[PDB]
Design a protein around this ligand. Structure first.
Ligand SMILES: Nc1ccn([C@@H]2O[C@H](COP(=O)(O)CP(=O)(O)OP(=O)(O)O)[C@@H](O)[C@H]2O)c(=O)n1
Ligand SMILES: [Mg+2]
Ligand SMILES: [Zn+2]
Lengths: 147, 221, 94, 170, 56, 55, 110, 1112
DNA sequence: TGCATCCGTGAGTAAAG
DNA sequence: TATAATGGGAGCTGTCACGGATGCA
């Protein structure tokens, strides 16, 4: 990008690279239900290791995994996103055998259902905000003040 | 005040090589095999090319047209892949509370392997502008506090400090080290670059990343 | 640019919260025939028709100009939703 | 595919303000048609909605006052302009529509770069955000005059270019 | 002489110091006067403007 | 209620029969003269439902 | 018959079925015109008394979907079939007068 | 006016017939004028000879064919939506071998489409063009192996769908393999089947690096030809019972059957030339005296081993050399489809021969002509190369007829086309134009035949050169292939000659494309003209040598898009090709012999020739083309005119006195103008609309059918329910709009009533009926109205009814009505202009004349182009044109400047000096001195270094005028433009992309069947596509509600869209949406795949999005 | 434990068609 | 409702790169 004179912030490349490093490979299951060579999200294996250490058990030995952008997108948890991406019959057969539930965390899944995406004005952080004039606000504070 | 000169100098139109083809010579040309013709086009567009010169050039013209044609599809495919990996990444909270960070280097090893020399201004800007410092920095009698959003002036100051030998790398919150699940926090992301101020919780940051990497894709030669 | 947009972004912690507040206030105005406006007669946004200046019909213009005054309160969990709806229907019918 | 949408050839229109575009009258009549039927009934232009629709069905039936009614419909409202390819988010931007005779959309000069638009025949699409929510989103978040810096680099994106730079330099 | 880079820096500085409303007004003003002046400046292209240098 | 998840899973023959309103026994679509659906064919109104509302 | 997935044009871009509009489902204009018709009919029926409005709604099918005979409406209200026919007639006459006066239902007759 | 022309190159030969590729290809393939006995074994005759005889016992043999006369002439076919075609009869004879009985008959096989005089076709009433296809020529090739360097692949390629590709390869284990139908087996086996013995192969291949030992297998020579043949059949047919006659049949059909295997005659010749051998037929082997005899295999193996060892005189082949790519023209493509139809007919023939009462079997009882008819009809209606003819202007049709495609049946799939195919090969020189190709996906795959190029009988493109003997340039011209061309040193066409002798010591020439400086002794040939390197379109660009190729491409292509203008003009600067293009395109009309003109009319010209005969040429007047542009011929002679042979009688569309007239000559000022010409936009003067410059006539066709229904007939009627006389004003008695009416959007053109669908009126309908006491009519208004944003003047109505003479419609329809609507389109804001140099832009502003920059003498300019469009694009040619145009404005003359051989700067300066005298000495005589503003501009120019200081005002203005620049006054202020401005005459065309055709908008409208989403396209009143990337745009903004609207309320949330429309017409805020219907379709299409998809809540309890309507 | 080899899959947007 | 009849034709081809499963030595 610099060679072509394109100014572009590292933030964006970092977001993508972060998704490229999303998964990890098991090297020793420890006291877990996992298998050697199994692949899973780094967040999930860290949560499991904290739950096993808090339980006094042996943690899961794991190794960092780098996958390219296509395989990272196909390996994501939401089966709606993965099936709408690419390799639809493969995504769908594995998800249906596994009885996957798509929790609708992302944007594609919610777009497919026509739901309101979890971003912008759709963020839980802002969409529950209320507005009221001081006239009506005092008229309601009086009703709360009577009972 | 020559019109070609003014237009090129101001940034309104034209670059030196086009003006050269108009006034100087057209230059060396490529064969279809990518190998160059030993004989250049000595004519400018003002003088007019010969039939043979024109034909010799049409190879490179067609090669560049086919290059652009085959490149737009690969860029679009890349952008769609980037959108599919990043789309759930949103600014979901104000601070994940991580203590991890990355250190943007201000120097890079010379290709001579001789010493370390300062990185290019634009490169440090694209690495630092609008980021939150993960640690106190004290340079040139100034305190850049932990938690500060690096303004462009903050960046030029850090470049000055590096030029004065006072700092080699800057610690900075980054999405590489953020710990927000399904997304990223506000301090780790930094500026909404489009507003020169901290990002608003709720920004579809992953989509913006994909579009920022993809949109210049068809300019990559 | 929207009149006073920089101050409006100054009001909220997230730009999207400004949008949610403005849109909810605009719907409040449309539902209650603008009878609940916190604007004095001179602060009313006007529209220059062929006849003369008339009330701006655009509830969003109204909501932004109201927001700019300070006479509006916004936040999360200020009141139960049905209490708000019924109190507004009491003070300003349909 | 989507409703309340149109498309036409684009044309420069340098007299516009940054938050503005030129929308042809006929496009606007169709894109805002339900609003226009309602507003026609509000004034005296038709007894009801169905009479207003029958009145707009034929072109020789359409009278001057309806156009004035259209101006009251769109007042303060914005429309989305889009140019394909939509390479990044500034491929869609929101504008306050200024009605025009003629059949070409007028596009402000300072946004051409972000759209990668020139006037060698390009065409853009128009979309009408319907609800108060969508209209507030368009006016706050997607308005041209609020999106001046690049989300990718942070550098100005709407900025002087060819003739503007030329005259200032001169 | 104001050119592409210096005008870009003007827009960015104006943004930081004055807000997007005033910067949008600034941009429209720049557009107005740039167009006006470029009209009457005398800028054109004839073949004798592609000046072949003697050193060639 | 509000949709929050979407599950996908294999369907048992019993589940597939629970979905079905009738077995399609004839490979026939519509009658060449009436232009109405054929009985026990791919368009039978007995299986899939009325062509006209409430009729 | 012909295939709905017949190719149009020389790419793999469009199907022949993509240009076939659905005639079955009512258009938003159609649904809205039906809604405004029902609301204007209730508007004009509120200018009658409750009985003549109910007799009209029973005899034309706006209540339970079907039209009743004069004998059924007369047995329901407890009157003779001639009386129920007469109050239907006077209800229609009042509706005709109100319509000539206000013209609020003409445009729906196409 | 006077036509001064430049140029010093005399062109020995003229341009060949420009449509000869099309016309001659089809003539050769049909042989309709050849008496049957004299026909050659080519074309459809060769197809007949291939299919016949038909055996097994009965035999059906082919004697001859004949083509009758067309049932209807070309115009009648265009009107009646018929195909212009000839009946095809074939004379056949049946023979029973044992009986000896011989029954003979001429059977009718259907029709074959005939090609019109200009090289086009008329299929179902619409003109179509069959585009020539480029492909790899058949033959034997040797390419490098991309894995193993020192190894090479031998490939043996027959005609498309005339046999299998065969590869020979030297494996890592040393044995020589043969790949056929994707099966690798040792070649030694097939060599044995050919009757070769180890002695002969040893003495033929022993010389090469011991490589022949990789061919030595003992188990193969241990068996005779029959055992090796059965071994090969087993190796090629796993599971098939290896019978003897079965194996002989399979191998013969695979390698020696001229009815299954066919190298081209070109493949034959090229194999002969490459391997240095001679071929008997067009197959790799033969069946002679019961055994198989080799033709090609051993020569190929010998060449392969020789190239592998490295012995000289053996080279790998360049497969993009135009000596290895050939053209499949109209005749060859149609012949292939004919051959396929014939094969199907023969299958049916044998089918009927096996059964049936064999006592009474005639030729008529055995031939079902339907498969042949279907194959031809398919080729001409739905082939990738059968394209809707481009007749926007005559140059459009010419270019379309001369285009070469690498796509289509038997060609390349896109995305399977790398850089190599799309490159301009060195051998393209003189054969395929290097600039006329599309920008975008098809670049380098659709190209154009160069202007002097011809395609020979073998299908290779040939270009002409002059013979050069001892530095003397003959007039003997030789058309070469690229293979032939590579043998010679060929000088450039501009090399200076005194008489016929090369007058230069050093000469610029080519050797295998490589440029080289050479002495006249070494020169063997010389180019005919610069014109021979480029296409016809590119040859229409004056000053092409000053234009970057990327923009020449655009100007070249955009001439095809020029709209015929009612006042069209030829350019004031021409290339000298503008007349040939009008003549060859059959646009204009010409005199057949010397004669005197008897009658002249708006409709017809009658000529008395030297034979005393009276010939009447009718004129085509206001006819609608495929693209809706008007095609009318106007007469250009007068009563009593003497005309010689070939003199102009009538100007076609876009012709001015026989010169190609694609646009207007306008007066241009090259300066910015207040942003209204920012970024390629154009500013024009209202004076152009005033004098009807850039005004064009356009005709649209509207059509409606009335058919029989199971509910009663449709009928065209004036009796349409619920309509006033205001709505029926311009409808005639029968219901069709009257010729001459002005129709606007919404106006009825043809009344029609349709019986209502079976419907119980909703109780609301019943009560409204009772209130208004009016029966619902049986029928409903289904009339054909004017679509949004269209209209004009009715000029024709056609009505066809069932039961009328000569008329028969398709089953069911009672009557068909067509209405032709004309419209005169003035230029408007949004329309597209362009010049021949790639400068294109959309009219953005039309100023009144008093705002237009004007010359001191009061003359305002026509259009204002922005100078910022030039430097980045490097199309300086439009500048020189403008300069020359300036001179022509005041001298009152036009010019011919051949490309690369045209007007140079000094001669343009001479002309400009003369013009300045006409422009300024007039002023000095009329009694006016230099103006004060002129002095101010002269001061400014003096500071710019444009004029010398100390000269007089007149001298300095003359200096500027010599630079092409003049003083220009702002119309709005009267103050001068501070600098002198380049003003001059430019040729500018109005392109087919007019905004009237493109502006579209929709609130609500038709929805699709399954998806319940809006239809697409202006014709369907469709909605815009808000695709994946538009969704990303809305997401990145965080416009959750705008996006959700797009996904629900505006597309396919049925309840949502209805409720939104109702809320808006009532004045309420739009309701919250619900599920989009296409997601329900997704759920049901997954259920159809045995996948249970379940919408749950946070308690993992199912949610029914179908509202119970599908749960029992 | 490592390589060759084969099969499946994907390869830009809007427009018109 | 009755001579006897007993194993098929069409392939069709200028990418391309990757990723992952199979196949050999
Ligand atoms: N197949 C296609 C054809 C067109 N387009 C779109 O149309 C424009 C063509 O650029 P362009 O070639 O017109 C830029 P030009 O004006 O010539 O030069 P400049 O840089 O000095 O301004 C691109 O920006 C694309 O977004 C596409 O996406 N795919
Ligand atoms: Mg463009
Ligand atoms: Zn964080």
């Amino acid at each position: 990008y610099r060679a072509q004179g394109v100014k572009l912030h590292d933030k964006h490349i970092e977001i993508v690279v972060r998704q490229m490093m999303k998964y990890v490979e098991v090297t020793d299951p420890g006291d877990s239900r996992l298998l050697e060579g199994q692949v899973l999200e780094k967040w999930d294996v860290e949560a499991l290791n904290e739950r096993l250490i808090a339980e006094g058990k042996t943690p899961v030995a794991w190794k960092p995994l780098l996958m390219g952008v296509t395989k990272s997108a196909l390996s994501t948890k939401s089966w709606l996103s993965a099936a709408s991406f690419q390799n639809t019959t493969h995504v769908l057969t594995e998800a249906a055998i596994a009885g996957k539930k798509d929790e609708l965390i992302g944007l594609k899944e919610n777009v497919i259902l026509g739901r309101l995406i979890p971003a912008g004005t759709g963020s839980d952080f802002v969409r529950f905000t209320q507005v009221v004039d001081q006239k009506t606000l005092k008229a309601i504070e009086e009703a709360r003040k009577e009972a | 005040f020559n019109p070609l000169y003014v237009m090129a100098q101001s940034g309104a139109r034209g670059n030196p090589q086009q003006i050269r083809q108009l006034c100087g010579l057209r230059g060396l040309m490529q064969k279809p095999s990518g190998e160059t013709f030993e004989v250049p086009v000595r004519s400018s567009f003002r003088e007019g090319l010969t039939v043979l010169e024109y034909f010799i050039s049409s190879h490179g013209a067609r090669k560049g047209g086919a290059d652009t044609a085959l490149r737009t599809a690969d860029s679009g495919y890349l952008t769609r892949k980037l959108v599919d990996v990043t789309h759930e990444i949103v600014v979901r909270e104000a601070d994940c509370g991580t203590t991890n960070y990355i250190s943007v280097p201000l120097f890079q090893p010379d290709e001579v392997t001789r010493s370390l020399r300062l990185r290019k201004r634009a490169d440090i800007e694209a690495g630092l502008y609008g980021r939150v410092l993960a640690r106190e920095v004290e340079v040139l009698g100034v305190r850049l506090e932990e938690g500060r959003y690096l303004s462009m002036d903050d960046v030029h100051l850090l470049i000055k400090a590096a030029e004065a030998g006072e700092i080699q790398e800057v610690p900075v919150r980054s999405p590489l080290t953020c710990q927000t699940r399904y997304g990223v926090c506000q301090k780790c992301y930094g500026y909404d670059l489009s507003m020169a101020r901290p990002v608003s919780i709720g920004e579809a940051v992953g989509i913006v990343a994909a579009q920022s990497i993809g949109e210049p894709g068809t300019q990559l030669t | 640019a929207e009149p006073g947009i920089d101050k409006l972004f100054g009001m909220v912690d997230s730009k999207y919260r400004l949008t949610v507040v403005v849109a909810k206030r605009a719907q409040q105005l449309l539902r209650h025939g603008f009878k609940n406006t916190v604007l004095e007669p001179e602060e009313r946004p006007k529209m220059q028709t062929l006849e003369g200046l008339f009330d701006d019909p655009n509830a969003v213009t109204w909501a932004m100009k109201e927001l700019l005054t300070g006479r509006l309160v916004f936040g999360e969990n200020l009141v139960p939703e049905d209490r708000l709806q019924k109190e507004m229907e009491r003070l300003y019918p349909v | 595919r989507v409703d309340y949408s149109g498309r036409s050839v684009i044309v420069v229109g340098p007299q516009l303000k940054l938050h503005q575009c030129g929308l042809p009258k006929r496009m606007a009549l169709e894109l805002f048609k339900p609003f226009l039927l309602k507003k026609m009934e509000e004034k005296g232009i038709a007894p009801n909605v169905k009479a207003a629709r029958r009145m707009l069905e034929r072109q020789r039936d359409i009278k001057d006052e309806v156009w004035d009614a259209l101006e009251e419909v769109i007042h303060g409202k914005v429309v989305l302009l889009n140019r394909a390819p939509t390479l990044h988010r500034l491929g869609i931007q929101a504008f306050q529509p200024v009605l025009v005779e003629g059949q070409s959309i007028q596009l402000h000069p300072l946004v051409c770069e972000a759209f990668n638009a020139d006037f060698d025949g390009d065409q853009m699409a128009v979309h009408v955000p319907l609800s108060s929510f969508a209209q507030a989103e368009a006016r706050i978040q997607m308005l041209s005059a609020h999106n001046l810096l690049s989300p990718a680099s942070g550098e100005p994106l709407a900025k002087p270019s060819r003739d503007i730079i030329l005259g200032l330099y001169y | 002489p104001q050119e592409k880079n210096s005008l870009k820096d003007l827009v960015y500085q104006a943004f930081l110091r004055l807000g997007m409303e005033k910067t949008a007004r600034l941009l429209d003003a720049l557009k107005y006067y740039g167009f006006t002046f470029s009209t009457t400046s005398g800028i054109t292209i004839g073949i004798d403007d592609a000046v072949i240098p003697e050193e060639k | 209620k509000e949709v929050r998840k979407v599950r996908i899973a294999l369907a048992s023959p019993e589940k597939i029969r629970s979905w079905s309103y009738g077995e399609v026994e004839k490979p026939e679509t519509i009658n060449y003269r009436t232009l109405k659906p054929e009985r026990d064919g791919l368009f039978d109104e007995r299986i899939f439902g009325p062509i006209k509302d409430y009729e | 018959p012909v295939s709905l997935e017949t190719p149009i044009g020389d790419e793999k871009d469009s199907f022949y079925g993509d240009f076939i509009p659905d005639e079955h489902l009512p258009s938003p204009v159609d649904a809205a015109t039906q809604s405004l018709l029902s609301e204007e009919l209730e508007k004009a029926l509120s200018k009658l008394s409750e009985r003549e409005a109910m007799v009209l709604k029973l005899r034309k099918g706006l209540i339970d979907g079907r039209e009743h005979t004069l004998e059924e409406v007369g047995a329901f209200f407890g009157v003779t079939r001639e009386r129920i026919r007469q109050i239907e007639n006077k209800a229609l006459r009042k509706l005709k007068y109100h319509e000539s006066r206000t013209r609020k239902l003409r445009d729906f007759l196409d | 006016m006077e036509i001064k022309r430049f140029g010093r190159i005399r062109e020995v030969i003229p341009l060949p017939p420009l449509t000869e590729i099309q016309v001659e290809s089809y003539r050769r393939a049909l042989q309709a004028d050849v008496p049957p006995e004299k026909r050659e074994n080519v074309g459809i005759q060769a197809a007949f000879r291939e299919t016949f005889p038909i055996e097994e016992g009965l035999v059906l043999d082919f004697l001859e064919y004949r083509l009758g006369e067309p049932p209807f002439p070309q115009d009648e076919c265009r009107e009646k939506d018929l195909t212009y075609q000839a009946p095809l009869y074939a004379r056949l004879q049946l023979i029973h071998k044992d009986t000896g009985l011989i029954k003979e008959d001429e059977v009718f096989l259907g029709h074959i489409p005939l090609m019109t005089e200009d090289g086009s076709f008329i299929i179902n009433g619409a003109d179509r063009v069959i585009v020539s296809q480029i492909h790899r020529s058949p033959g034997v090739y040797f390419t490098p192996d991309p894995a193993r360097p020192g190894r090479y692949i031998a490939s043996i390629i027959p005609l498309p769908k005339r046999g299998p590709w065969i590869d020979l390869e030297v494996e890592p284990n040393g044995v020589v393999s043969m790949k056929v139908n994707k099966r690798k087996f040792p070649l030694v086996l097939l060599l044995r089947v050919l009757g070769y013995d180890q002695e002969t192969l040893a003495r033929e291949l022993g010389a090469y690096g011991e490589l022949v030992q990789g061919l030595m297998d003992e188990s193969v020579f241990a068996m005779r030809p029959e055992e090796a043949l059965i071994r090969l059949f087993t190796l090629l047919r796993p599971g098939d019972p290896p019978k003897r006659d079965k194996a002989v049949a399979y191998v013969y059909g695979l390698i020696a059957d001229p009815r299954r295997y066919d190298l081209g005659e070109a493949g034959r010749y090229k194999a002969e030339e490459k391997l240095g051998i001679r071929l008997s037929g067009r197959t790799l082997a033969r069946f002679e005296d019961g055994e198989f005899k080799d033709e090609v295999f051993l020569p190929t193996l010998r060449y392969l081993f020789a190239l592998t060892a490295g012995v000289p005189g053996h080279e790998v082949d360049d497969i993009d050399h135009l000596g290895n790519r050939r053209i499949r023209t109209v005749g060859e493509l149609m012949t292939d489809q004919f051959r396929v139809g014939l094969a199907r007919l023969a299958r049916g023939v044998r089918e009927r021969m096996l059964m049936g009462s064999e006592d009474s079997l005639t030729p008529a009882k055995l031939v079902n002509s339907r498969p042949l008819e279907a194959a031809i009809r398919e080729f001409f209606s739905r082939s990738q190369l059968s394209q809707f003819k481009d007749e926007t202007n005559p140059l459009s049709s010419l270019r379309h007829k001369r285009r070469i495609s690498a796509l289509g049946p038997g060609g390349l799939t896109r995305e399977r086309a790398g850089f190599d195919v799309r490159d301009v090969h060195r051998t393209h020189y003189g054969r395929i134009c290097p600039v006329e190709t599309p920008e975008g996906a098809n670049i380098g795959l659709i190209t154009s035949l160069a202007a002097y190029a011809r395609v020979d009988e073998l299908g290779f493109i040939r270009t002409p050169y002059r013979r050069v003997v001892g530095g003397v340039v003959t007039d003997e011209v030789v058309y070469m292939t690229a293979t032939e061309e590579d043998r010679y040193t060929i000088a450039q066409a501009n090399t200076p000659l005194e008489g016929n002798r090369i007058a230069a010591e050093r000469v610029v020439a080519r050797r295998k494309g490589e440029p080289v400086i050479v002495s006249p002794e070494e020169v063997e040939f010389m180019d005919v003209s610069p014109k021979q390197v480029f296409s016809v379109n590119t040859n229409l660009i004056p000053f092409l040598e000053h234009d970057d190729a990327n923009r020449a491409l655009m100007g070249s292509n955009m001439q095809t898009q020029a709209v015929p203008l009612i006042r069209a003009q030829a350019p004031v600067v021409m290339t000298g090709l503008e007349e040939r293009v009008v003549r060859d395109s059959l646009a204009a009309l010409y005199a057949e012999e010397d004669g005197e003109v008897a009658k002249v009319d708006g409709n017809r010209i009658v000529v008395r020739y030297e034979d005393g005969r009276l010939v009447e040429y009718p004129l085509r007047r206001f006819y609608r083309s495929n693209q809706g542009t008007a095609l009318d011929q106007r007469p250009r002679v007068v009563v009593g005119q003497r005309v010689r042979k070939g003199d102009l009688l009538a100007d076609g569309p876009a012709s001015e006195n026989g010169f190609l007239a694609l646009g207007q000559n306008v007066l241009v000022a090259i300066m910015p103008f207040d942003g209204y010409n920012f970024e390629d936009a154009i500013v024009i003067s209202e004076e152009l609309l005033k004098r009807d410059f850039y005004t064009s006539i356009h005709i649209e066709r509207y059509e409606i059918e009335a058919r029989d229904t199971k509910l009663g007939p449709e009928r065209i009627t004036r009796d349409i329910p619920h309509l006033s006389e205001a709505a029926l004003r311009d409808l005639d008695e029968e219901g069709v709009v009257r010729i001459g009416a002005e129709v606007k959007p919404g106006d009825i053109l043809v009344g029609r009533t349709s019986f209502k669908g079976e419907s119980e009126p909703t109780p609301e309908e019943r009560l409204l009926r009772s209130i208004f006491g009016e029966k619902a009519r049986d029928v409903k208004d289904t009339s054909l109205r004017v679509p949004p944003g269209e209209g004009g003047i009715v000029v024709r109505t056609v009505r066809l009814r069932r039961g009328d003479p000569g008329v028969e419609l398709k089953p069911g329809v009672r009557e068909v009505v067509r209405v032709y609507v004309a419209q005169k389109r003035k230029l408007q804001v949004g329309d597209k202009l362009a010049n021949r140099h790639g400068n294109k832009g959309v009219v953005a502003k039309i100023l009144p004349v008093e705002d237009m920059p004007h010359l001191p003498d009061g003359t305002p300019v026509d259009v204002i182009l922005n100078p910022l469009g030039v430097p980045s694009r490097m199309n300086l040619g439009q500048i020189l044109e403008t300069h020359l145009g300036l001179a022509g404005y005041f001298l009152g003359q036009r010019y011919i400047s051949p490309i690369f051989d045209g007007a140079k700067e000094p001669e343009i300066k001479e002309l400009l000096a003369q013009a300045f005298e006409v422009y300024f000495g007039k002023r000095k005589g009329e009694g006016f001195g230099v103006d004060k503003r002129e002095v101010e501009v002269l001061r400014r120019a003096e500071k710019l270094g444009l004029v010398t200081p100390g000269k007089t005002p007149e001298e300095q203005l003359k200096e500027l005028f010599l630079q092409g620049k003049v003083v220009l006054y702002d119309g709005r202020t009267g103050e001068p433009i501070e600098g002198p401005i380049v003003v001059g005459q430019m040729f500018i065309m109005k392109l087919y992309h007019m905004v009237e055709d493109k502006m579209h908008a929709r609130s609500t409208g038709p929805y699709s069947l399954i998806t319940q989403q809006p239809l697409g396209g202006k014709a369907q009143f469709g909605g815009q596509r808000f695709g994946e990337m538009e969704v990303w745009a809305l997401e990145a903004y965080g416009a959750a509600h705008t996006l959700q609207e797009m996904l629900t309320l505006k597309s396919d949330d049925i309840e949502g869209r209805n409720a939104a429309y109702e809320a808006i017409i009532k004045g309420e805020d739009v309701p919250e949406p619900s599920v989009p219907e296409s997601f329900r379709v997704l759920v049901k299409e997954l259920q159809a795949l045995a996948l249970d998809v379940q919408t749950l809540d946070e308690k993992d309890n199912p949610v029914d999005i179908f509202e119970g309507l599908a749960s029992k």
